[PDB]
Design a binder for this molecule. Structure first.
Ligand SMILES: Nc1ncnc2c1ncn2[C@@H]1O[C@H](COP(=O)(O)O)[C@@H](O)[C@H]1O
Ligand SMILES: Nc1ncnc2c1ncn2[C@@H]1O[C@H](COP(=O)(O)O)[C@@H](O)[C@H]1O
Ligand SMILES: Nc1ncnc2c1ncn2[C@@H]1O[C@H](COP(=O)(O)O)[C@@H](O)[C@H]1O
Ligand SMILES: Nc1ncnc2c1ncn2[C@@H]1O[C@H](COP(=O)(O)O)[C@@H](O)[C@H]1O
Ligand SMILES: [Mg+2]
Ligand SMILES: [Mg+2]
Ligand SMILES: [Mg+2]
Ligand SMILES: [Mg+2]
Lengths: 323, 327, 327, 320
């Protein structure tokens, strides 16, 4: 039977005995992702270039993508606190539209390389508000282990939405002819070990000796097996999704321009770690599992190594050797 | 004033006082590219997954996409009445256009690179180079054995976050953005030029163990600059259109160089290296094999390989300085 | 606050304390309508005309729209797990859903009304009525033989200059515009109500020689008002969905009455007249056979015909008074 | 062998040995019509209704699209639009030699009910050697170089009439391309449908009343014609071209010289009809022979299958 995101989400919520609040939230997020995809593919750009007589582009697209997510989630009546990469402070939903959920998201990740039309993407993570206090930024400071749902949209050669919940990881392809996300890979599981590593090797000078050693073993295998292939798009959604689909390992470790890491814990690392763990993968900072870091600031950064468990375990063995 | 690919091509054809044959070829290629973009973005995939009660998925969808893209380009170019010989990355032999539809142009193309890149849903591209048939002999694969310098037009379409067509001709490089709401390529970057020195290098460092000693030293110098300037950034998508386009837009260097086990490189000269070398040189960049300019190689086989290092001229010259140090 | 069909239907389901079954049905219908819309606007027609050669067509692609439409609606409703008995203009007998997929609802629909003249690009449409199952026993086509009064939901999609879904339920009539750029039905008109009296009449006057004398007199009053008021304008698209939507939007009257060669009219009671009558009544309009309300007829055959006169209430009342005068 | 509008137009230009100017004009109209279609189908309406938190009328937008695309083609010198009281004169730097008269969005009267709407165009070559003026648009339809319409119905079709005949192109929205689907089109000799607003029955000339009576009670007592009246000229005329038959907008008392406009409604449709082997008459003469004195002047029109038009004229000549 054909399955769609709308039907899949409605049926999981029926199975969950819930009230429909999270269903309405995920419904609203789907709409926003379809509207982001349309703009990312440049529908209507002819009007910007004067087709009807009327005459920062990358910037405005991430602002618009933020507005679409913010508006769709607000009017869902399902949220109370929204944290966005585009916004310095947490947004507090007005009282008459408040619901039970906190949403952390990057509405257009990798946006700043739109000039090259590289893949861009959306990342989101959904929490049940935990405190009974008046809503505030504190409600978003929960460890990733508390995630109820998380995932991402990739605006690549096609638009795909990956949604991770308690039930596992499911991938949906957008059919632009009808505006429906079609279920195409069910209960995805990452392979135990891959043949691809992904990281910005331009920071090789700043690399920890654990990282340098691990990556040396991927290029020059001490057992003389085949070297791993390398890929790095520089957009987290593209690089993590390739790791999910093919296996392997993605690293963005600390460097001396980013001693706490480059990626952001709340709306980049935590959602991707959650998808990885639900897929049978791993996600570590080196010191602890990403999902166990307790945030103290909503835009704080973390180092991340994630992907196939044998590859992450192999990295972690090299890491404790450098204790 | 807004400009479209169709209007731009038509006006350049008028300025050239051509017969209109090349214009028709490029109109045909543009339609084909719009058709590939629609398939790449997965229009109608709901019907494949049973929305109307029918079909299983069966086989290799990525392969079928490459084949479908090849059939779109082949058929639009055949029906243009502007071509006689078609060389495609997807076909063993050159396709000879039937007598009734023969025109004067030779087209080498790679219609899509889905199968040759395990990256899934990250970018895909089409590359093309257009030559004028040089002899009046009955058409054969020999008519595509021309050096890249003989190209009249070349370029690529990138199916990325948006669909972009880059077209290079004697008038320079121009970049057109596909507006899917209306099926028009909108002119967005005019007479593009690459910057003389960039800050990004692009190659597959998994192959590091098989690197020629000069590639190792060059890359080491990008990661550990001897003058303690800032290291270059690294990006490697695995799709030639994507990696070359970023080099064009941001500057820097892209390398798929020769080495011991692959003494002629891996990429193909006629429909990968030559069109990109032409775009680079028209943009004021460089494209070398290490031994010579890509566009000066005279091919002897239609699927022959070439090493290629291309991009900002100061970076390519710096690599050639290191390459000659190890001669 | 923006509102979509998905969000609207979901909240209404939460309001009425449903189990979500109707909601999944309506979600399924929405998806089929989107796919029908895409086919009607001729997405992919270029493959039918050989853009990729002869080999690249046949699947859902080669089916006529009436067949494709039936397959889309049939399949989406079956896979909704919310229906048990389906009635379509396309199939002589009601379809009994497999027990593994059965829900509690009965759906009567016309997958593509007006496809008659889809050749001239006239607006066409989809019509649907939803009943709950009443019977103690195994689902059978007698479950669909309910009066229009038992409807829980009804409406139509119009594929005209734009695609619109008109949904009628207990809460009233609501209208959703399909945004093709993102594939969402946007709530654009809420709790819609017909005007009390219109200035347009709508019927096929070409068959005037066979008109019932009561229809002859009522049409004459429209064109030759006995009080020197302004005569009504005439519109007849020949596609029921388009004519009924204009009647809802602009007011007036639409007639497909009984004549003498056609004892009970031509339009079908279950999946043409009944849904349209339900929309009209929820909008403060009217719909009669001449002798009783359409929604009161007790059907005995799932494909039985019914005369229909519907629209603004003062216009249907004037017709009835002329009609009862001749009875 | 598939063909597109772009490739068909360019190939006809090559055969004509034209300089490319009219081909650029027609390319430019093709783009405008694709953009009108996109807006008519309501792409982007979600933004109007606040999907991102926070408006030109369709007819205004459509006029802007055609006007700007034609101006920027460098192929035109005088543009007459139903939306503009005076003719637009193109600035010297963007001037070509063609005069274009058009209705950017006919039927938008009642777009509130999502009826079919259309764009109609007629293209003339400027004869004079002098400065372009409104007078250059005052030509009989006989002088047309090209005419047609785009119908935004259940699907979008462009019908183009030229010397070479009538050709029909279907817009494939997946790829944004007009595909040639019906070639060298000819209308049926006689149809079975008549199209007019019978709400004006009280004002009909007795020729029209008697002709309509012939359609409902046939004198050879064949089957009565069916009736259709969409109320959008493009939709009713296109059905007439596809199925044969007759379409009439005759004189009534709020429109004593007809309601439809000669330069950009009647003349383009008359020219499609004639190139398809049909006819179009005011009743007194061929539409294409009327010499206009006002760019917005109205004309009565009866057009369609040749046998049905001749039959009307035979009834008309009786009441002469
Ligand atoms: N559509 C859904 N998919 C998966 N889980 C759900 C869904 N709806 C509700 N749940 C679960 O039920 C809980 C309460 O749902 P709600 O009543 O919608 O807030 C959520 O926090 C989830 O754990
Ligand atoms: N649309 C065009 N853009 C750029 N150059 C063109 C174009 N059309 C023709 N030319 C040039 O004129 C030559 C002959 O034109 P043709 O008669 O179309 O083959 C071509 O090989 C090009 O060098
Ligand atoms: N989405 C909805 N909109 C309006 N009424 C509904 C909806 N869902 C359920 N209902 C009402 O509640 C009944 C039971 O719903 P269900 O259990 O989903 O079949 C239906 O037959 C309707 O009367
Ligand atoms: N694309 C075309 N299709 C049909 N006829 C054309 C075309 N281009 C030119 N012609 C004919 O040749 C004349 C001169 O064209 P031009 O030099 O473009 O003004 C026109 O007025 C038409 O009669
Ligand atoms: Mg961002
Ligand atoms: Mg290939
Ligand atoms: Mg029907
Ligand atoms: Mg008009």
């Amino acid at each position: 039977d054909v399955n769609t995101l709308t039907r899949f989400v409605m049926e999981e919520g029926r199975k969950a005995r819930g009230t429909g609040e999270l269903t309405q939230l995920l419904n609203s997020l789907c709409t926003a992702v379809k509207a982001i995809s349309s703009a990312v593919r440049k529908a209507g750009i002819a009007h910007l270039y004067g087709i009807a007589g009327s005459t920062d582009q990358v910037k405005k697209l991430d602002v618009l993508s933020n507005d679409l997510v913010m508006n769709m989630l607000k009017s869902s009546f399902a949220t109370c606190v929204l944290v966005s990469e585009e916004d310095k402070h947490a947004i507090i939903v007005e009282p008459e539209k408040r619901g039970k959920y906190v949403v952390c998201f990057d509405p257009l990740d990798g946006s700043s390389n739109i000039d090259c039309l590289v893949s861009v993407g959306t990342i989101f993570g959904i929490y049940r508000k935990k405190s009974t206090d008046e809503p505030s930024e504190k409600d978003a400071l929960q460890p990733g282990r508390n995630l109820v749902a998380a995932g991402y949209a990739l605006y690549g050669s096609a638009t795909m939405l990956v949604l991770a919940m308690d039930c596992g990881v499911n991938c949906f392809m957008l059919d632009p002819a009808i505006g429906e996300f079609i279920l195409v890979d069910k209960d995805v599981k990452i392979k135990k070990k891959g043949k691809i590593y992904s990281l910005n090797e331009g920071y090789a000078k700043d690399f920890d000796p654990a990282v340098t050693e691990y990556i040396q073993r991927k290029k020059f295998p001490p057992d003389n097996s085949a070297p791993y292939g390398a890929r790095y798009v520089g957009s987290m959604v593209a690089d993590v999704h390739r790791t999910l689909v093919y296996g392997g390992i993605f690293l963005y470790p600390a460097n001396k321009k980013s001693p706490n890491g480059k990626l952001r814990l709340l709306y980049e690392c935590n959602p991707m770690a959650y998808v990885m763990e639900k897929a049978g993968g791993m996600a570590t900072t080196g010191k602890e599992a990403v999902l166990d870091v307790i945030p103290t600031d909503i835009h704080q950064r973390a180092p991340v190594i994630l992907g196939s468990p044998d590859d992450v375990l192999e990295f972690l063995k090299v890491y404790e050797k450098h204790s």
